[PDB]
From a paper:
LUBAC is a heterotrimeric ligase which consists of the three proteins HOIP, HOIL-1 (also known as RBCK1) and SHARPIN. Two of the LUBAC components display Ub ligase activity, HOIP and HOIL-1, and both belong to the family of RBR (Ring-between-RING) ligases. HOIL-1 is a member of the RBR E3 ligase family with the ability to ubiquitylate its targets by linking a hydroxy group of the substrate to the C-terminus of Ub. We show that HOIL-1 activity requires linear tetra-Ub binding which enables HOIL-1 to mono-ubiquitylate linear Ub chains and polysaccharides.
To elucidate the structural features which enable HOIL-1 to exert its unique catalytic activity we solved the crystal structure of fragment 366–510, which comprises the IBR and the RING2 domain. The overall structure shows that both domains are linked by two helices, which are positioned at a 50 angle. This arrangement brings the IBR and the RING2 domains into close vicinity to each other and allows them to form an interface which buries a total of 1,303 A2 of solvent accessible surface area. K457 of RING2 is a central contact point for the IBR domain, and is coordinated by F382, E383, V386, and N387. The C-terminal histidine (H510) of RING2 forms a polar interaction with D385 of the IBR domain. These interactions, together with further hydrophobic and polar contributions by D458, K456, Q455, I452, V467, and R464 in RING2 with N387, K403, and L401 of the IBR, create a surface which largely obstructs the catalytic cysteine C460. We therefore assume that the observed structural arrangement represents a catalytic inactive conformation of HOIL-1 in which the catalytic cysteine of RING2 is masked by the IBR domain. As expected from our sequence analysis, the C-terminal part of the RING2 domain of HOIL-1L reveals a unique architecture not observed in other RBR ligases so far: The C-terminal 36 residues form a loop structure which is laced up by a binuclear Zn cluster coordinated by six cysteines. This structure adopts a compact conformation which packs against the second beta sheet of the canonical RING2 fold. HOIL-1 displays a tryptophan (W462) instead of a histidine located two amino acids downstream of the catalytic cysteine, questioning if HOIL-1 requires a histidine to assist catalysis as observed for other RBR ligases. The C-terminal residue of HOIL-1 is a histidine (H510) which forms a pi-staking interaction with W462.
Residue numbers in the entry: 366 to 510
Amino acid sequence: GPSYHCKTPDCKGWCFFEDDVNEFTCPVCFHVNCLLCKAIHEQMNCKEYQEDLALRAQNDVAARQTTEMLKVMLQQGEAMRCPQCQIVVQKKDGCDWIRCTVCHTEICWVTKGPRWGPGGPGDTSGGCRCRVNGIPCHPSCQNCH
Ligand SMILES: [Zn+2]
Ligand SMILES: [Zn+2]
Ligand SMILES: [Zn+2]
Ligand SMILES: [Zn+2]
Ligand SMILES: [Zn+2]
């Protein structure tokens, strides 16, 4: 069970990652962190945050740093786009499964795509079909729900 450090400057707030929890309310500074954007964006959904962050690339050097950082993460695994709404999702250490914050699509992190077909939970006509006939979606999978 790995951990996340609050993004408020110099804050000592931290949490463990949990499969079903995508937001961290810091007990120190009380700010709400988003555990898939790794950022505090309390008047935005994740899509509004990520688009505005790309608009600050022209030009903030800090934003341009992180936006180009993310584009290497996506091009090399350790980050991915939601297969449904296409927001950039970053890893939650120890969690093989994530429910998108914007569209609520279940994402299989092990296989870097959807958990299920359209029609959602139970539809093994798409997605990673973990455990059908006993086979895990990947032999490293431990629990993608
Ligand atoms: Zn904090
Ligand atoms: Zn977010
Ligand atoms: Zn989504
Ligand atoms: Zn899976
Ligand atoms: Zn699996």
